Amino acid sequence: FMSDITVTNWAGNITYTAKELLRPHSLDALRALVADSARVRVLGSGHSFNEIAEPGDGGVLLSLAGLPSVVDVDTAARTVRVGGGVRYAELARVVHARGLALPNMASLPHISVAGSVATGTHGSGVGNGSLASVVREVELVTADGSTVVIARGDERFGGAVTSLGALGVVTSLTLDLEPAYEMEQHVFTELPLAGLDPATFETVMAAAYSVSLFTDWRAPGFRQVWLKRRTDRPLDGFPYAAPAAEKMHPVPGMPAVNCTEQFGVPGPWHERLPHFRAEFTPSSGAELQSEYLMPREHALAALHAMDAIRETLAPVLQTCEIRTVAADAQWLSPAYGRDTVAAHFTWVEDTAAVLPVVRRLEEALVPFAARPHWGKVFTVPAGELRALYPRLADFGALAGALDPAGKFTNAFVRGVLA
Numbered sequence: 001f002m003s004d005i006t007v008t009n010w011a012g013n014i015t016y017t018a019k020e021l022l023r024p025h026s027l028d029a030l031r032a033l034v035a036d037s038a039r040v041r042v043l044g045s046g047h048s049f050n051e052i053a054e055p056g057d058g059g060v061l062l063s064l065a066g067l068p069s070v071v072d073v074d075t076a077a078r079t080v081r082v083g084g085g086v087r088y089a090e091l092a093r094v095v096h097a098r099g100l101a102l103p104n105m106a107s108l109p110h111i112s113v114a115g116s117v118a119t120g121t122h123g124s125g126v127g128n129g130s131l132a133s134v135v136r137e138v139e140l141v142t143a144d145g146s147t148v149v150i151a152r153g154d155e156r157f158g159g160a161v162t163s164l165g166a167l168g169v170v171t172s173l174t175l176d177l178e179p180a181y182e183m184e185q186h187v188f189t190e191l192p193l194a195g196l197d198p199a200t201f202e203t204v205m206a207a208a209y210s211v212s213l214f215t216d217w218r219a220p221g222f223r224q225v226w227l228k229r230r231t232d233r234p235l236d237g238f239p240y241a242a243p244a245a246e247k248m249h250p251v252p253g254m255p256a257v258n259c260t261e262q263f264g265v266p267g268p269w270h271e272r273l274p275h276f277r278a279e280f281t282p283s284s285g286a287e288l289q290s291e292y293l294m295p296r297e298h299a300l301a302a303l304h305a306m307d308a309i310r311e312t313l314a315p316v317l318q319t320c321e322i323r324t325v326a327a328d329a330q331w332l333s334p335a336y337g338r339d340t341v342a343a344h345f346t347w348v349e350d351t352a353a354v355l356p357v358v359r360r361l362e363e364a365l366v367p368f369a370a371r372p373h374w375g376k377v378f379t380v381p382a383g384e385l386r387a388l389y390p391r392l393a394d395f396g397a398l399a400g401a402l403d404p405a406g407k408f409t410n411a412f413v414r415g416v417l418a
């Protein structure tokens with residue numbers, strides 16, 4: 001019963017030093033565990049790919065999986081209060097049943113809400129903010145066990161959602177909602193990079209509510225284009241690529257059964273925004289991930305820099321996805337303060353082969369002020385990375401106020417706060 005266990009992230013490339021995952025079964029127990037522990041980090045659903053959740057030797061790794069997962073919709077207010085450990089699939093089910101909806105979702109819905117917003121998680125669409133952008137309040141258990149609630153409008157709130165877990169344990173969050181809406185997903189194949197000029201790139205990325213491009217970086221250009229269209233908005237002809245003949249997966253050869261419905265068949269928002277259907281429930285994945293988030297005005301130059309090194313990228317690549325994100329108010333969001341283009345890479349799970357490719361990719365993106373996704377694999381040096389965040393000092397002051405001893409600062413966060 002008392003024997004050591006091995007605790008990893010979802011993809012299993014990160015093995016934590018913790019020999020047990022503590023899952024307190026009450027908020028009283030959680031407060032006491034936090035107060036009594038010298039160093040703490042929280043594990044959500046483990047869909048990070050780096051050391052962000054590692055608390056160091058002797059540090060406590062705790063989870064909310066032992067507490068009830070509550071999803072409380074106020075229909076008149078159009079809000080939902082959720083536990084930090086609740087995952088997006090359940091959140092979406094419950095809000096949809098109340099006739100309400102989120103403005104966006106990530107690719108796969110089986111990810112914790114608190115952990116998603118902690119790192120900058122986003123979907124696509126030129127007018128759609130990050131997942132954090134709909135949070136209007138957070139509730140934290142701080143280092144001494146006490147609760148601090150921070151709401152939108154509080155001078156601190158810009159640092160309180162996407163915080164890398166550095167302020168305390170987020171026990172609940174409240175999100176804003178909109179009326180439930182219908183969508184259609186239309187997939188296309190073969191979009192050239194040649195002739196993808198500023199006007200055409202803008203037209204393509206704005207052609208639906210959320211648009212992704214996918215490529216293998218093998219033949220020139222893009223292999224797929226996914227349009228996720230609201231039925232309450234117009235859909236113009238899309239002459240730029242061929243209509244897909246078959247149901248598609250982002251990664252060529254992987255099972256398209258896993259993916260949300262295509263061929264433009266209408267269905268609800270939460271069955272169209274993700275790329276992966278709720279029924280698809282993988283307990284791990286044999287992959288790594290990286291993503292770089294740049295000013296949207298650099299999209300073409302960045303795509304052209306990556307095209308020039310395509311032969312270096314391709315051998316370790318499962319798929320690359322290009323997305324857009326609206327400017328974020330959160331100080332540590334990779335989309336902070338600027339409309340954004342994102343370049344995501346799902347790699348083969350071969351750390352030794354991937355890291356040198358990541359380093360070369362990062363070099364290629366330096367001219368475009370690329371910020372890495374905090375949840376994913378990156379090798380940007382700490383000082384260089386700190387220089388990319390205008391309000392980093394403000395964040396550090398907030399962390400110092402709420403957590404003076406740095407109970408929630410691990411090695412990952414320490415390099416951000418240095």
Ligand SMILES: *Cc1cc2c(cc1C)nc1c(=O)[nH]c(=O)nc-1n2C[C@H](O)[C@H](O)[C@H](O)COP(=O)(O)OP(=O)(O)OC[C@H]1O[C@@H](n2cnc3c(N)ncnc32)[C@H](O)[C@@H]1O
Binds near residue numbers: 041053108115120285
């Ligand atoms: C696995 C995965 C991830 C993923 C994705 C697809 C898959 C298969 N698609 C994404 C996408 O479309 N867009 C996007 O921007 N990200 C996508 N991701 C990445 C993923 O969403 C993030 O890496 C996310 O942060 C993972 O959250 P999760 O909860 O699974 O991961 P974690 O390692 O356990 O924790 C991450 C950080 O959050 C802190 N955390 C977690 N819970 C809390 C609470 N309650 N309070 C304070 N912090 C918390 C962790 O400590 C860690 O720092």
Ligand SMILES: [Cl-]
Binds near residue numbers: 192
């Ligand atoms: Cl091309």
